Amino acid sequence: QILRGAAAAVVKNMNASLEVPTATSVRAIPAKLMIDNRVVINNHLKRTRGGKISFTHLLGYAIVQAVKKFPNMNRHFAVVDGKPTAITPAHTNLGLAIDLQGKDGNRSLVVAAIKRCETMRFGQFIAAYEDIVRRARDGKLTAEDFSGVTISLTNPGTLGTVHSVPRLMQGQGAIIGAGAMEYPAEFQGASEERIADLGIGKLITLTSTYDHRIIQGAESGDFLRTIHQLLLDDDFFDEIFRELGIPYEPVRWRTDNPDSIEDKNARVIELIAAYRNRGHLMADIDPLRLDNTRFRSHPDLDVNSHGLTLWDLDREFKVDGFAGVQRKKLRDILSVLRDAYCRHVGVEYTHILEPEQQRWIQERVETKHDKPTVA
Amino acid sequence: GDESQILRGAAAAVVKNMNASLEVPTATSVRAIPAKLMIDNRVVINNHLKRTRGGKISFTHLLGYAIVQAVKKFPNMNRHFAVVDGKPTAITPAHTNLGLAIDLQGKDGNRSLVVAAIKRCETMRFGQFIAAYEDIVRRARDGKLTAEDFSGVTISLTNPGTLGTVHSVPRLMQGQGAIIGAGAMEYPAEFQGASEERIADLGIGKLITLTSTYDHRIIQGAESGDFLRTIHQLLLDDDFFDEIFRELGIPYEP
Ligand SMILES: [Ca+2]
Numbered sequence: 001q002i003l004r005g006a007a008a009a010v011v012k013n014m015n016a017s018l019e020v021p022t023a024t025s026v027r028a029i030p031a032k033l034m035i036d037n038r039v040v041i042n043n044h045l046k047r048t049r050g051g052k053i054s055f056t057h058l059l060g061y062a063i064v065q066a067v068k069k070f071p072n073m074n075r076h077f078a079v080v081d082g083k084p085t086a087i088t089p090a091h092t093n094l095g096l097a098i099d100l101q102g103k104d105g106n107r108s109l110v111v112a113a114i115k116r117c118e119t120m121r122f123g124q125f126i127a128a129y130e131d132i133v134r135r136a137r138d139g140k141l142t143a144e145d146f147s148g149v150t151i152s153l154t155n156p157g158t159l160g161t162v163h164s165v166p167r168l169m170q171g172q173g174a175i176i177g178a179g180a181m182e183y184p185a186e187f188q189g190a191s192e193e194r195i196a197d198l199g200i201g202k203l204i205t206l207t208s209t210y211d212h213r214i215i216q217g218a219e220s221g222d223f224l225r226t227i228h229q230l231l232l233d234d235d236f237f238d239e240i241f242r243e244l245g246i247p248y249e250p251v252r253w254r255t256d257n258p259d260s261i262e263d264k265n266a267r268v269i270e271l272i273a274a275y276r277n278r279g280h281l282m283a284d285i286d287p288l289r290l291d292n293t294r295f296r297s298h299p300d301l302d303v304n305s306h307g308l309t310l311w312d313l314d315r316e317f318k319v320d321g322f323a324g325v326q327r328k329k330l331r332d333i334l335s336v337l338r339d340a341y342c343r344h345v346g347v348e349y350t351h352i353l354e355p356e357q358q359r360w361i362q363e364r365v366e367t368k369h370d371k372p373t374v375a
Numbered sequence: 376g377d378e379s380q381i382l383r384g385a386a387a388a389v390v391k392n393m394n395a396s397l398e399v400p401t402a403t404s405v406r407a408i409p410a411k412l413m414i415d416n417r418v419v420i421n422n423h424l425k426r427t428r429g430g431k432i433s434f435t436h437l438l439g440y441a442i443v444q445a446v447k448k449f450p451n452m453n454r455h456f457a458v459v460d461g462k463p464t465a466i467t468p469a470h471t472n473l474g475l476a477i478d479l480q481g482k483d484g485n486r487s488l489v490v491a492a493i494k495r496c497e498t499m500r501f502g503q504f505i506a507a508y509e510d511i512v513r514r515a516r517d518g519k520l521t522a523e524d525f526s527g528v529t530i531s532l533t534n535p536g537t538l539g540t541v542h543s544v545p546r547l548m549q550g551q552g553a554i555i556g557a558g559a560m561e562y563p564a565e566f567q568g569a570s571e572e573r574i575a576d577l578g579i580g581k582l583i584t585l586t587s588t589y590d591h592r593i594i595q596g597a598e599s600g601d602f603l604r605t606i607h608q609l610l611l612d613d614d615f616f617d618e619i620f621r622e623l624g625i626p627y628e629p
Contacts, residue, residue, distance in 0.1 A: 019397070021394065021397055021546055022546070023543065023545050023546045024544040026540065026541055026542050026543065026544070027539065027540050027541045028541050028564035029564060030564045030565065030567045030568055077390070078380065083382045084382065084383040084387045084390045085380035087378050087379075088379045089377075090377035090378060148376070184565060198569060198577075199566075199569030199573060200566060200568075200569065201567075203563075203564035203565055212546050213389075217533065217543065218478070218488065218538065221543070222538050224539075255567075255570060256568055256569045256573065309568075311568055311569070
């Protein structure tokens with residue numbers, strides 16, 4: 001029997017949080033949208049100025065914006081002079097489960113709080129998140145950071161745990177348990193080609209244990225619905241792409257096109273030629289970004305218009321000699337065309353009458369060109 | 376830190392009730408039931424009722440009725456723990472009064488969530504049950520509920536699945552033996568992206584994640600686990616729908 005010392009502080013907090021009558025609302029959200037959008041976000045950031053967006057960045061941001069819609073989710077129950085008074089904090093401080101691997105292997109799990117989140121845009125939020133991350137990683141966190149957690153987030157889904165029912169400490173209104181973003185247990189045995197061909201996508205089991213003294217089942221149930229609406233919304237990703245300097249149209253949650261691969265093939269062939277004819281019309285060649293509508297005012301380049309969805313992204317199409325390969329996945333086809341035409345080099349080569357000249361430019365444009373040497 | 380602490384008045388009653396539920400040791404049994412049967416049967420029920428005499432059956436009508444008939448099979452599900460003169464005595468109520476989560480949208484938008492009770496459910500057929508349900512609904516909607524309606528809830532039912540919340544782990548209040556949390560009747564998250572023509576061609580159906588949080592001082596995991604199994608047997612049974620069609624004046628085979 002070893003007496004607890006530093007961990008005894010954690011033990012007393014579990015006993016203190018026992019007076020809190022909690023309940024838990026659980027909901028599954030299809031994540032196939034933010035997965036396929038992260039694909040573009042981290043590729044575009046890597047090819048321009050660095051930076052990497054993780055799934056928690058999007059998750060925490062949606063939590064913060066949903067807190068604005070539901071005010072009682074930030075508040076926490078308290079008793080002042082024998083009165084049932086509920087504290088309404090000025091700043092919505094998102095607590096994070098940051099596991100600091102110590103000097104002798106001691107995994108010191110801390111709750112760092114990103115403060116003044118309600119007064120932030122996607123850029124300001126991820127800047128304050130990465131400050132709290134860079135400083136926690138190098139042990140430079142002040143004691144003031146740990147004081148002020150009004151609402152928090154945990155990720156038991158890191159270890160593959162589908163969903164959890166967390167225990168809520170005093171001082172908080174609710175704590176969101178983000179589940180395991182993955183394919184369900186039954187599908188784990190089938191081939192990827194089988195799954196994408198039917199239209200089954202990965203999902204996150206988002207839980208929300210809340211204080212039942214102040215927050216009631218309807219408010220917490222609607223709070224999780226609101227987060228679901230954001231994670232599958234179009235304006236949410238429109239705002240995120242604007243803040244990340246991405247001028248291109250983000251992926252939209254579209255339900256599978258029930259057409260055959262033969263029917264879809266001629267659409268994909270035609271879309272390739274459409275990107276070759278007017279790749280320059282939707283490229284980021286204006287350094288001043290004066291006309292922001294040039295990126296969205298083109299249906300001949302919009303994939304959703306050509307009878308295609310994010311589900312068709314992983315399917316093979318008989319693209320006759322596109323990137324040399326006679327067969328290619330849709331997400332590979334749209335990535336070659338993005339980097340070749342819609343990046344910073346608009347190409348008008350289709351209007352030339354000599355054929356070998358078009359063939360020549362096609363090879364020198366539709367290839368993943370090597371990044372120049374540091375010299 | 377620039378905060379506003381408001382003293383609770385009417386809501387303070389709700390706060391002190393959440394404290395009383397702290398002494399009730401609760402555990403929750405969760406079970407998913409394919410609802411494709413009651414969905415396709417509701418299709419016929421509301422079409423036949425519309426073409427003959429009016430009336431509309433909602434999914435909660437069928438759900439509450441099955442809860443009431445399952446309570447007859449398991450008696451310990453209606454009972455609630457109590458202490459009389461320092462003795463562990465369990466109350467066995469005479470009438471099984473099903474609690475309803477009725478959200479009354481008030482005068483200034485104030486959604487006053489009440490717990491009305493359909494009484495003497497054990498002595499009822501499908502017709503008598505839905506008549507007593509619609510009386511409690513029509514009167515709650517127009518603020519004509521007596522204080523006598525709220526006193527007597529022996530077993531309650533909540534619907535977090537209204538807002539799309541897959542399943543919930545509710546908090547059980549004192550005076551109730553068990554409270555059932557009806558999940559969201561829908562297709563799972565993964566399938567949400569595929570076409571309807573794809574789904575029906577394979578044979579995948581909608582489902583409801585029915586939860587059951589109970590008082591561990593009297594009810595045990597096996598009884599609550601079997602209670603939910605019994606409800607599932609009913610929601611996919613043939614005689615259950617045969618009885619309902621008889622009570623609704625539908626002569627055709629369900
Ligand atoms: Ca499943």
